[PDB]
């Protein structure tokens, strides 16, 4: 029986534990003896299952922390709407979105920094933004700063509500453990109620607000003369002027004359030629269909009325001759281990963010997004990075489950047990795949660089020499181009111009165009396959050997996070699953850097550019297919050539990017001191420094220590990632703002 | 035991175990049904009485301008011309006075009998409640001393009329959205031509 | 117990009813520490007495100006008018004089707070008993209370303390109203009262134009 | 740092423009842009899609050193 | 209030307050006296 | 009334409800095995109908009848019928 069960007033609201750092931990609550305690307090703060073994207390902490995160996100979102309302050129941009650059940040005049308030157009000075908010606000139908102010105020009210709820559901009415373990009810509610009703309500907003206002905007009406959204709500004749089926009202819906609504629920495909964005009527039909599908999906699981599926029964039924007991025991794992749930959800959420990056560049859903090249590059790169980090986190929390929550008694000859029982085969086969991929992907580039340096371009892997055509992807492109003819007859156009066909041009600039694939694309895709497989190898090997190995048979007793098991057995540094996360982060960085470099160069060379009478003048003039098949081509024609904007940015509004470019190079190099060294050296150096302080009677009572081995690794990888990613960030943004 | 208890709780919301804290407790939910019921009876009588009296000529205001959603509550749907005070100043007064009433009632709920202790211009004599939050009684709230022997029957009648009024107020809202006319205008069109004026013809 | 600010709610436990104006109001528990509570008591007294003097010096000149007998400028303009009318008295000299005089008296009050009765030693011009102080925030003596209204009887002193703290809180709220009304109307407070008296159903916060920017 | 200094100061002296070092070396973007970026242009064009010249051995060894450096990490 | 002021006396809160004061002082000096190179 | 679409919708809802009432569908009080064999289930839901037909069964079967009828109507309009 699914029911609400809470405990009343479980935790008093008091500042007493605020005054006692480390109160949550039995080891840390006694206070410091050394400086290691300062770091351990922050490192252990959100490790709830380390604080207690009671699953109910952990779950309550997780629920209220999630409310806190939602409140922070709403404060951030309300800030973005407020800065659009108060510190932006949004209304001017609305009158002229082709020539005016979006800006919603203004710097104060002090120490000369007002040079960063660039001349972005619309009689406005400020920092140019690349988040895409203007295009999103325009698609929503927002025409004034007053509506941006209203959303900002409403967001802060909802942010306060989230913070109230987190306090309330931890301190006043904390749900019991059986409430959280109602996974069938939660899936039913999150499918039908969150996603389904969310999509239905957003289809409602699109149909009643976004469609008529954007129709008038693309007709050329001044935004100040467009009627407000509630005028389209209250005056059905006003909406029927733009969509004549609205004169029939809701009668076509209730009599199943759905084809009457074809004027605002469409299946055009492709892009709106005025704006370069997806048709908003297509989006309304999409979100309506999505809403219906999710509302149906939320009725699968049994809660209180007999009908529906038991997830445990489904899992226990799916077993076969190769797989022993199959999915038995997985329901108990996924209803008792928060870490197993986090591993799955991080893997899929990160993969989703990466898919979002690809789908939004190829099918730009916002008006004037596709010709705002800075915004396009930024959102692709951002969502790619978020996805990669989330996937590495999935590997981490899978390993944490394996160390802390795995129980061999509950996994006898099931899928998890059998996977552990052939981990050597899995890891050795993946090792071979990674070596093969590295050879036959990177060695092709090395072959090409060597042939080109020796003056033998005819011996190269290229489109004008030994060819490696990606014929499968080319066939996929041709199939998707030909789809409106036969396999999707009621769709007027293909889903994206990238498959084939004509250039979509907005304001004399390319919004989208066919993206052809040749030998360089083959080579870089196999680079992607190689880097992804190596990152998988590191993370999966960390998960499979988290508990034991032939080297260290009792590794689970050493925990998830430990530096080593000593210099013996030849040396066992970085055997822990945590250290596999540490190495997988670097390989994720390598992989995703090549992915976003591939994106930036290929769009600049083959898609983006200006339209003339003769054709398209691309930003870097088609040089991807000529030189992306050598490493020297990447180094010269991408890195050296395109860094001209960031290193010449001094004295302009883009000078902040030049400074951040240098500072990020610095932070990256700074990280190597942590990664390459070891704490024994630093502790001895601190001994000499401490002697100097003791001589002058300025030695602290909290005894200074070098960072732990694990903290040295964590600091090193954090500064490595921050420096490298911020270097690419400044390079990208200065380049595409200055030449876009 | 409870008045108007039909055993209708398909979402088991009045289950007592586990629902100790918060607003999903049984006591709060019965109290809230009673409060909703009484407000709905005031609304269901009041959202159609000016229209009925204007149609019959008892009041001089035209029936179009005293329709409940055109009299100032939703100014996009209409504003009544010149009350003695503008609606926002009236709302300010309403906030102050209704907050006084509602916070005193709430303090009786959380702390029963506490509103009969502190000086309130002598009004605290009749504001001690009864220990039952939905049914305070006393010398004012039951000033005619009704329900000497049929108090449970009167509670059932109050809840039945309140549920009917709640449904009627929902009907007022739905019919206002669908037809953009008053509820009595809808009733008279249904009476004058029943086949040609209903939900199938308004859709 | 005593009357409380929110009837039916128990008063804040660190407030016991001994202080004047104790209605148990401390929802943030700012007076949890007793020494910080004494400091906040002196803060409230200084704020309330300053507010009462200032509200008198706004209201009575504005009432006299409204009658037409005099032409005293409104409170938000008086510094500008004074400076324009006093070119031989610079702003910085006036500020320096005010800062040194208030510094002397406020440092004496501060040192009495740190050490009660320590200004009674006769260092300032031989004054001994008049600077000893009666209680926290209530100096008394023959200089601060020359009519002796605190030395008559206990109940009279408690009555006057209640009168003082309640009128002081009212004057603080009134000064907040003065600020808000000047920002919303651009007029003085007696001008606002006269406009409301002439036509009250039309002269309300809802029609000033800034409280409801619709 | 020592050899960067020697080479950049002498590059300005040999090309007859001492003002490049004197003005750009006081900040690190000057070092990056006017020493490393500016003087790598002929080197990385030792081989390109258009052909190769005698600097192609140095372009290849340049990349070779970058690769060996990275492998050490 | 004693527990709250003890929290405000924890090292990062004191660091935040002190560095906000120091940074604000430097910023306002450079606002009132722009571009100081020499004494 | 009497129109084609009304006929498909009413007929589909009626047959799905009647199949549920007479034990030819999974219901609240009878559930299907993996091999699709109906066995009784103690749902605890009160029902005045002697066959154990609950309001939950009415809601789900009317929904499925509406879904089948609407898909059939749109498909027959698309096919030309
Ligand atoms: C396929 C035909 C068929 C269908 C769809 C239904 C459907 C229903 N019958 Mg049922 N009956 C049907 C045939 C018969 N019923 C009954 C005798 C009853 C009784 C006595 C009752 C029902 C009731 C009900 C309802 C029970 C669910 C509910 O609580 O809703 C609400 C439901 C609408 C109950 C009901 O709700 O009546 C209003 C009820 O009390 N039926 C007989 C005579 C044996 C039938 C003969 O075929
Ligand atoms: C993640 C959210 C976020 C971020 C990164 C920013 C960032 C910024 N804001 Mg915006 N803001 C946000 C959310 C955000 N804000 C929200 C939710 C609101 C509505 C309350 C605002 C309302 C707002 C205003 C009204 C202003 C800013 C200003 C600023 C800038 C200077 C802030 C400063 O120096 O503080 C100062 C730091 C202190 C410690 C002093 C705080 C003092 C206050 C009174 C408390 C900075 C770019 C300023 C601006 O851009 O200048 C042109 C400015 O005037 N913000
Ligand atoms: C239709 C019902 C419904 C809806 C809409 C949601 C929605 C949500 N749940 Mg789920 N939940 C439900 C029923 C629902 N829940 C039931 C029945 C259970 C128990 C089986 C749970 C158990 C549960 C847990 C254990 C957690 C969630 C979390 C979440 C959030 C996921 C993150 C996100 O996408 O934020 C999107 C955010 C927004 C769109 C902002 C608006 C959200 C509105 C204000 C909340 C609406 C849902 C709420 C249930 C309505 C009740 C109102 C309340 C006053 C009673 C999201 C707010 C996670 C979390 O984030 O919670 C803090 C989380 O850890 N839920
Ligand atoms: C450019 C720097 C660099 C290079 C070349 C490598 C090399 C390798 N890494 Mg290492 N890695 C690096 C940086 C590098 N790493 C850094 C900075 C870290 C720290 C985070 C790591 C951490 C790391 C981990 C954690 C793992 C690797 C793995 C691998 C291997 C991937 C499989 C493969 O591609 O084999 C093919 C080899 C190459 C592509 C190298 C180039 C080979 C050339 C083209 C062939 C030349 C042959 C030559 C001409 C013949 C000899 C002639 C001569 C003797 C005269 C490969 C040996 C993974 C692995 O071991 O899985 C199998 C693995 O799990 N690396
Ligand atoms: C992820 C979102 C989420 C989830 C899963 C829950 C879950 C729960 N809440 Mg919490 N809550 C949330 C967000 C959420 N809440 C937010 C954003 C707020 C502040 C607005 C609150 C403030 C709150 C209060 C004050 C109470 C709950 C209560 C409850 C419980 C019963 C709710 C119910 O019966 O729904 C049915 C919903 C309704 C009957 C009203 C819906 C109307 C709104 C406008 C929609 C349940 C444990 C109750 C509980 O703890 O006591 C048992 C309770 O009293 N919640
Ligand atoms: C908090 C107390 C306070 C403050 C800060 C002010 C401030 C001010 N008042 Mg106001 N006043 C107050 C209380 C106050 N008053 C009270 C209680 C009444 C009654 C008045 C009645 C009043 C009138 C009738 C006038 C002022 C004026 C002024 C201004 C000139 C003051 C001056 O010239 O000193 C005068 C200094 C001396 C007489 C010398 C000091 C005496 C020593 C012993 C030498 C100045 C803005 C004038 C104005 O508005 O603009 C010029 C004005 O006409 N006040
Ligand atoms: C704690 C550091 C600090 C210091 C020493 C000062 C100092 C000063 N501020 Mg400054 N201020 C600060 C932080 C600081 N401010 C912060 C964090 C903000 C919000 C961003 C401000 C916003 C601010 C404004 C808006 C004004 C001052 C003004 C002043 C001056 C008179 C008061 C004085 C020079 C005033 C002025 O410039 O001189 C009259 C003035 O109008 N400040
Ligand atoms: C009267 C019987 C009947 C007929 C003739 C059709 C005919 C059709 N239906 Mg349909 N349907 C029916 C009853 C029927 N349906 C029933 C009982 C259901 C279950 C509710 C559905 C559920 C259904 C859905 C959900 C959809 C169709 C769609 C279609 C079209 C599919 C075209 C295709 O080949 O895609 C082949 C696809 C791939 C090979 C991939 C076709 C016109 C689709 C349509 O509307 O597109 C125009 C569509 O989305 N049907
Ligand atoms: C019991 C059951 C059980 C299970 O378990 C669950 C479930 C199922 C959920 C449940 C069900 C239920 C129900 C249905 C609910 C709903 C309701 C109603 C509607 C409410 C109202 C409610 C309603 C009410 C408040 C009301 C009131 C009204 C008001 C006063 C009004 C007023 C008016 C006036 C006169 C006039 C003017 O001109 C204006 C106005 C101002 C506008
Ligand atoms: C015999 C009998 C009786 C009768 C019964 C009846 C008469 C019944 C009926 C019933 C019915 C007749 C029912 C139905 C229902 C229905 C429903 C429940 C539906 C729903 C629907 C839906 C949910 C929809 C949805 C949708 C939409 C909205 C859109 C999209 C698509 C879809 C379709 C999904 C009585 C009890 C009196 C008595 C005893 C005996
Ligand atoms: C540099 C380095 C150190 C030395 C670095 C240390 C000890 C970190 C120092 C951090 C800060 C700067 C220490 C002081 C923090 C106080 C809170 C400062 C208060 C002063 C105010 C001005 C804020 C290691 O300990 C180490 C350990 C393991 C592998 C690699 C390394 C490594 O590379």
**Pocket probe mutation, ligand 5, options B15, B22, B110, max atoms within 8 Å of Cβ:** B22
The label of the residue with tokens 């289950």 reads B15
One DSSP character per residue, chain C reads ----SSTTSPPPTT--S-STT-S---TT-TT-SHHHHHHHHHHHHHHHHHHHHHHHHHHHHHHHHHHTS--PPPTTTHHHHHHHH-TTS-HHHHHHHHHHHHHHHHHHHHHHHHSTTGGGSSTTTT--GGGS-SBTTB--HHHH-TT-SSSS-HHHHHHHHHHHHHHHHHHHHHHHHHHHHHHHHSS-HHHHHHHHHH-TTTSSGGGSSSSS--
Strands in A118-119's sheet, in edge-to-edge order, are A103-105, A125-128, A118-119
Q: State the CB neighbour count (10 A cutoff) for residue C98.
A: 10
Q: Does residue A145 contact residue A85 with C-beta atoms inside 8 Å? A: yes
Pairing of strands D47-48, D51-52: antiparallel
Q: Note whether C7 contacts B92, CB cutoff 8 Å.
A: no
Q: Give residues 274 to 313 of A whose Cβ lies within 8 Å of B.
A: 304
Q: Which of chain C's residues have a Cβ under 8 Å away from the Cβ of B115?
A: 7-8
**Pocket probe mutation, ligand 8, options F74, F80, F81, max atoms within 8 Å of Cβ:** F74
Q: Note whether A251 contacts B21, CB cutoff 8 Å.
A: no
For atom 12 of ligand 5, which residue has the closest CA? A165
Q: Does residue A361 contact residue A323 with C-beta atoms inside 8 Å? A: no
Q: What is the CA(A193)–ligand 3 centre distance, in A?
A: 9
**C-alpha distances in Å from residue A286, one per residue of A204, A495, F53:** 12, 13, 37
Q: What is the CA(F73)–ligand 8 centre distance, in A?
A: 10
**Pocket probe mutation, ligand 11, options A671, A678, A700, A712, max atoms within 8 Å of Cβ:** A712
Q: Which residues of A56-80 are buried (b: 16+ CB within 10 A; e: fewer)?
A: bbbbbbbbbeebeebbeebbebbeb
Our answer on whether F and D touch (3+ beta-carbon pairs < 8 Å) is no
Q: Note whether B203 contacts A254, CB cutoff 8 Å.
A: yes
Residue B143 sits at φ, ψ, to 5 deg, of: -65, -20
How was this structure determined? It was done by: cryo-EM
User: How many whole angstroms separate alpha carbon A644 and alpha carbon D34?
Assistant: 11
One DSSP character per residue, chain F reads ---HHHHHHHHHHHHHHHHHHTTSS--SSEEE-TTS-EEE-------SSTT---HHHHHHHHHHHHHHHHHHHHHHHHHT-
For atom 36 of ligand 10, which residue has the closest CA? F49
**C-alpha distances in Å from residue C176, one per residue of B162, C45, C170:** 45, 17, 10
Tell whether residue D69 is among the known ligand binding residues. yes
Nearest to A1 by CA among C172, B12, B31: B12
Q: What is the CA(D40)–ligand 11 centre distance, in A?
A: 37
Beta-carbon contacts below 8 Å between A and D: 58
For atom 17 of ligand 5, which residue has the closest CA? A162
Whether residue F51 has its Cβ less than 6 Å from ligand 10: no
User: How many whole angstroms separate alpha carbon A559 and alpha carbon C19?
Assistant: 59
Question: Residue B168: CB partners within 8 Å, gap ≥ 6?
Answer: B40, B44
User: How many whole angstroms separate alpha carbon A397 and alpha carbon A403?
Assistant: 10
Secondary structure class of A658 (helix, strand, coil): helix
The helix (run of H) or strand (run of E) holding residue A568 is none
Q: Note whether A647 contacts D49, CB cutoff 8 Å.
A: no
User: How many whole angstroms separate alpha carbon A20 and alpha carbon E10?
Assistant: 9
Nearest to D20 by CA among D32, D30, D6: D30
Structure tokens of A12?
A: 């008093």
One DSSP character per residue, chain E reads -HHHHHHHTSHHHHHHHHHHHHHHHHHHHHHHS-S----
User: How many whole angstroms separate alpha carbon A3 and alpha carbon A182?
Assistant: 9
Resolution in A: 1.9
Q: Does residue A103 contact residue A95 with C-beta atoms inside 8 Å? A: no
The helix (run of H) or strand (run of E) holding residue A174 is strand A173-175
The label of the residue with tokens 């289930």 reads F41
User: How many whole angstroms separate alpha carbon C100 and alpha carbon C81?
Assistant: 24
Q: Which of chain A's residues have a Cβ under 8 Å away from the Cβ of E30?
A: 110-111
Nearest to A132 by CA among A361, A496, A376, A380: A376
Out of B89, B108, B110, closest to residue C204 by CB: B89
Helices (H), A329-470: 330-336, 338-362, 373-404, 415-420, 423-453
Q: Does residue A142 contact residue A148 with C-beta atoms inside 8 Å? A: yes
Q: E22 vs chain C: nearest CA distance in angstroms? A: 26
Positive or negative: CA dihedral C193, C196, C197, C198: positive
Q: Note whether A453 contacts D44, CB cutoff 8 Å.
A: no
* Residue B144 in contact with partner chain C when CB distance is under 8 A: no
Q: Which of chain B's residues have a Cβ under 8 Å away from the Cβ of C201?
A: 84-86, 89
**C-alpha distances in Å from residue A64, one per residue of A70, A191, D17:** 10, 22, 66
Tell whether residue C163 is among the known ligand binding residues. yes
For atom 32 of ligand 9, which residue has the closest CA? B43
For atom 44 of ligand 1, which residue has the closest CA? F50
Total residues belonging to chain E: 39
Residue A604 sits at φ, ψ, to 5 deg, of: -70, -30
């Amino acid at each position: 029986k699914v029911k609400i069960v809470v405990d009343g007033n479980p935790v008093e609201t008091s500042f007493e534990r605020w005054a006692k750092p480390g109160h949550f931990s039995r080891t840390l609550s006694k206070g410091p003896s050394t400086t290691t305690w300062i770091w351990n307090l922050h490192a252990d703060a959100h490790d709830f299952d380390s604080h207690t073994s009671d699953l109910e207390e952990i779950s309550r902490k997780v629920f209220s922390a999630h409310f806190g995160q939602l409140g922070i996100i709403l404060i951030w979102l309300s800030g973005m709407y407020f800065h659009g309302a108060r510190f932006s050129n949004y209304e001017a941009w609305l009158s002229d979105p082709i020539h005016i650059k979006p800006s919603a940040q203004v710097v104060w005049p002090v120490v000369g920094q007002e040079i960063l308030n660039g001349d972005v157009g619309g009689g406005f000075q400020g920092v140019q933004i690349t988040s895409g908010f203007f295009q999103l606000w325009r698609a929503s139908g927002i025409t004034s700063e007053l509506q941006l102010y209203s959303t900002a105020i409403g967001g802060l009210v909802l942010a306060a509500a989230m913070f109230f709820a987190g306090w309330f559901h931890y301190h006043k009415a904390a749900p019991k453990l059986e409430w959280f373990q109602n996974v069938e009810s939660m899936l039913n509610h999150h499918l039908a109620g969150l996603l389904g009703l969310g999509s239905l309500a957003w289809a409602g907003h699109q149909i009643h607000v976004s469609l008529p206002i954007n129709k008038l905007l693309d007709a050329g009406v001044d935004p100040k003369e467009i009627p407000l959204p509630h005028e389209f709500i209250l005056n059905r004749d006003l909406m029927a002027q733009l969509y004549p089926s609205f004169s029939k009202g809701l009668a076509p819906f209730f009599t199943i004359n759905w084809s009457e609504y074809s004027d605002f629920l469409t299946f055009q495909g492709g892009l709106n030629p005025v704006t370069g964005g997806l048709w908003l009527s297509d989006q309304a039909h999409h979100h309506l269909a999505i809403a219906v599908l999710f509302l149906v999906a939320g009725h699968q699981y049994r809660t209180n009325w007999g009908i529906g599926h038991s997830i445990k029964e489904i899992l226990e039924a799916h077993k076969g001759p190769f797989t022993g007991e199959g999915h038995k025991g997985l329901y108990e794992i996924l209803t008792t281990s928060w870490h197993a749930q986090l591993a799955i959800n991080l893997a899929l959420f990160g993969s989703l963010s990466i898919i979002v990056a690809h789908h939004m560049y190829s099918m730009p859903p916002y008006p004037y997004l596709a010709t705002d090249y800075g915004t396009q590059l930024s959102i692709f790169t951002h969502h790619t990075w978020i996805g990669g980090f989330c996937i590495v986190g999935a590997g981490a929390h899978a390993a944490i489950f394996m160390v802390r929550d795995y129980d061999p008694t509950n996994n006898y000859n099931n899928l998890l047990d059998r996977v552990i029982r052939h981990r050597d085969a899995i890891v050795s086969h993946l090792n071979w795949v990674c070596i093969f991929l590295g050879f036959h992907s990177f060695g092709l580039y090395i072959h090409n660089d060597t042939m080109s340096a020796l003056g033998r371009p005819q011996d190269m892997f290229s489109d004008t020499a030994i060819q490696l055509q990606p014929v499968f992807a080319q066939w996929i492109q041709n199939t998707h181009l030909s789809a409106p003819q036969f396999t999707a007859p009621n769709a007027l156009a293909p889903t994206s111009p990238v498959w084939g066909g004509d250039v979509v041009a907005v304001g004399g600039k390319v919004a989208a165009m066919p993206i052809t694939l040749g030998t360089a694309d083959f080579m870089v895709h196999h680079i992607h396959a190689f880097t992804i497989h190596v990152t998988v190898l590191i993370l999966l090997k960390g998960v499979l050997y988290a508990r034991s190995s032939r080297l260290i048979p009792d590794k689970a007793n050493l925990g998830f996070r430990f530096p080593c098991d000593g210099p013996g057995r030849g040396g066992t540094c970085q055997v822990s699953a945590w250290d596999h996360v540490f190495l997988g982060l670097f390989w994720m960085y390598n992989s995703l850097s090549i992915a976003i470099f591939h994106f930036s160069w290929k769009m600049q060379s083959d898609v983006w550019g200006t339209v003339n009478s003769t054709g398209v003048s691309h930003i870097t003039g088609g040089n991807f297919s000529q030189s992306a098949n050598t490493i020297n081509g990447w180094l010269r024609d991408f890195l050296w050539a395109q860094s001209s904007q960031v290193i010449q940015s001094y004295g302009s509004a883009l000078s902040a990017y030049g400074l951040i470019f240098l500072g990020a190079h610095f932070i990256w190099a700074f990280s190597l001191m942590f990664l390459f060294s070891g704490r024994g050296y630093w502790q001895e150096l601190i001994e000499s420094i401490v002697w100097a302080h003791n001589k002058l009677k300025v030695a602290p009572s909290i005894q200074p220590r070098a960072l732990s081995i694990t903290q040295g690794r964590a600091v090193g990888v954090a500064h490595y990632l921050l420096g490298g990613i911020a270097t690419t960030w400044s390079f990208f943004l200065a380049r595409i703002i200055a030449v876009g | 035991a409870l008045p108007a208890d039909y055993g209708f709780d398909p979402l088991g919301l009045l289950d007592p175990e586990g629902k100790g804290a918060g607003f999903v407790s049984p006591a709060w939910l019965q109290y809230s049904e009673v409060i909703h019921a009484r407000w709905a009876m005031l609304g269901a009588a009041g959202c159609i009485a000016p229209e009925i009296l204007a149609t019959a000529g008892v009041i001089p205001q035209t029936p179009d301008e005293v329709i409940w959603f055109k009299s100032g509550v939703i100014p996009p749907a209409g504003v009544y011309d010149k009350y003695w005070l503008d609606p926002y100043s009236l709302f300010f007064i309403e906030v102050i006075l209704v907050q006084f009433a509602e916070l005193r009632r709430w303090q009786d709920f959380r702390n029963p009998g506490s509103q009969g202790k502190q000086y309130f211009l002598g009004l605290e004599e009749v504001l001690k409640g009864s220990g039952d939050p939905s049914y305070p009684g006393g010398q004012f709230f039951n000033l005619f001393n009704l329900g000497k022997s049929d108090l449970k029957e009167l509670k059932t009648k109050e809840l039945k009329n309140g549920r009917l009024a709640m449904l009627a107020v929902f009907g007022y809202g739905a019919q206002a959205v669908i037809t953009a006319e008053g509820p009595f205008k809808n009733l008279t069109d249904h009476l004058s031509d029943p086949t040609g004026h209903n939900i199938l013809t308004n859709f | 117990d005593r009357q409380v600010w929110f009837p039916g709610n128990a008063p804040a436990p660190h407030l016991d009813g001994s202080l004047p104006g104790d209605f148990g109001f401390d929802p943030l528990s700012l007076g949890s520490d007793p020494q910080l509570l004494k400091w906040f008591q002196q803060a409230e007294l200084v704020h309330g007495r300053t507010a009462m003097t200032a509200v008198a010096g706004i209201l009575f000149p504005a009432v006299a100006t409204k009658a037409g007998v005099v032409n005293i400028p409104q409170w938000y303009d008086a510094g500008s008018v004074w400076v324009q009318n006093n070119p031989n008295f610079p702003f910085a000299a006036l500020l320096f004089i005010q800062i040194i005089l208030t510094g002397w008296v406020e440092t004496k009050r501060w040192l009495d707070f740190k050490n009660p009765g320590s200004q009674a030693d006769g260092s300032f011009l031989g004054v001994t008993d008049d600077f000893k102080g009666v209680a926290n925030g209530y100096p008394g003596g023959k200089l601060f209370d020359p009519f002796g209204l605190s030395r008559g009887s206990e109940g009279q002193l408690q009555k006057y303390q209640e009168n003082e703290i309640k009128n002081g809180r009212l004057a603080m709220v009134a000064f907040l109203g003065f600020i808000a009304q000047h920002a919303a109307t651009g007029k003085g407070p007696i001008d606002n009262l006269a406009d409301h008296l002439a036509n009250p159903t039309a002269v309300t916060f809802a029609t000033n134009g800034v409280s409801l920017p619709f | 740092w020592v050899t960067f200094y020697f080479h950049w100061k002498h590059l300005g002296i040999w090309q007859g423009n001492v003002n490049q070092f004197n003005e750009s070396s006081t900040y690190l973007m000057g070092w990056l842009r006017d020493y490393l970026w500016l003087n790598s242009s002929q080197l990385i064009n030792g081989y390109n899609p258009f052909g190769m010249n005698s600097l192609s051995v140095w372009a290849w060894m340049f990349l070779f050193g970058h690769l060996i450096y990275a492998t050490g990490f | 209030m004693k527990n709250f002021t003890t929290y405000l006396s924890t090292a990062p809160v004191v660091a935040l307050i002190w560095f906000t004061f120091t940074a604000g002082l430097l910023i306002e000096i450079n606002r009132f006296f722009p571009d100081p190179l020499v004494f | 009334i009497g129109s084609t679409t009304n006929l498909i919708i009413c007929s589909s809802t009626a047959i799905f409800l009647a199949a549920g009432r007479f034990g030819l569908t999974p219901s609240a009080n009878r559930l299907a095995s993996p091999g699709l064999k109906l066995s009784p289930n103690n749902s605890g839901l009160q029902t005045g109908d002697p066959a154990g037909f609950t309001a939950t069964d009415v809601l789900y079967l009317g929904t499925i009848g509406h879904v089948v009828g609407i898909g059939s109507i749109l498909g027959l309009k698309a096919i030309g019928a």
